Amino acid sequence: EVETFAFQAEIAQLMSLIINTFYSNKEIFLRELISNSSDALDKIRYESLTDPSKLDSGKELHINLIPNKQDRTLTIVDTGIGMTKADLINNLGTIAKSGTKAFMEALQAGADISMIGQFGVGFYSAYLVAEKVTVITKHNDDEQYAWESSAGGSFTVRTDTGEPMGRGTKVILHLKEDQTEYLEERRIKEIVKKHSQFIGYPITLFVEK
Ligand SMILES: OCc1cccc(N2CCCC2)n1
Predict the structure, then answer these.
(1) What SS3 class is residue 34?
(2) I want to staple 129 with a disulfide (CB 3.0 to 4.6 A). Which of 46, 82, 104, 179 is the partner?
C-alpha cells in the first residue's frame, strides 16, 4: 500500500531550482546529508541522557557511506533518532517552508546553492546528483517507513518490509548517469576530508567488492 502526496508548492519550486539551475559545485550534497545525520545522532544521544532505554534499538552512533556501482547508488546510513510518519508527511515540509522562502530570497540577493544548509533545507541538495532519492527511516515511536521521490512535484510513503533497521535513517541516492564520480572511494574520501572532517561521529566509508 503506497500513498502518494504532493509537495507543497514552495518545496516543489525549490526542488526544480536545484535540478535545473546550472551549478557545478554539486559535491556539497554529501556535506549536507552528513550534517543532517550528525544532527539526528545528536538528538538521540541527548534524549538518551534522561532516558537510557531509548538506545535499546541500538547503542552505536555512527555514519556509514556505502557506494554501489552495480545499482548506481550512494547510501548514507546513520543510527540517529529517525523520523516518524508525521515527520515525513507533515512536520519536515512545514518547517522547510520558511527556510525555502528565505533561501530563495537569498539566492536572488547573490547567495549561491552551497549555502542551502544555513536555511534548514540541505536535504534537497541530494537532487544535485540523484535522479531519485529513497529514505528508509525508523523512529523509536513509529514503524519503519520508506519515503521516495523522483521530484516532479510528488513523493510516496509506505511501510517498509525490507531488512529492519533498529533505529535511524538511510538515504539512498539513485545517482544521475553523469554523477557516478561520487561512487569512487578516492572522490568520497576527498569530499569528507574537505567538508566533514570534524563531525563528532565515526564515518566509515565502505569500499566495493
Ligand atoms: O523538509 C526538509 C527536510 C530536512 C531533512 C529531511 C527531510 N526529509 C524529507 C522526507 C525525507 C527526509 N526534509
Answers:
(1) helix
(2) 179
3-state SS, residue 2: coil
Q: Is 93 in the pocket of ligand 1 (CB under 6 A)?
A: yes
- Report the amino acid identity of residue 38: S
C-beta of residue 87 within 8 angstroms of C-beta of residue 93? no
Cβ(147) – ligand 1 distance below 6 Å: yes
The dihedrals phi and psi of 169, each to the nearest 5 degrees, come to: -140, 140
> Are residues 157 and 88 in contact, defined by beta-carbon separation less than 8 angstroms?
yes
Structural contact between residues 165 and 143, judged by C-beta atoms closer than 8 angstroms: no
Eight-state DSSP code of residue 14:
H
Task: Determine whether the shortest distance from the Cβ of 88 to ligand 1 is under 6 A.
Answer: yes
Structural determination approach: X-ray
Under DSSP, is residue 81 helix (H, G, I), strand (E, B) or coil? coil
Give the chain's domains with CATH numbers: 3-205 (3.30.565.10)
Q: Which one-letter DSSP state was computed for residue 199? A: -
Copy the grid coordinates of residue 18. 536545484
Q: Which residues belong to the annotated binding site for ATP?
A: 36, 78, 97, 123
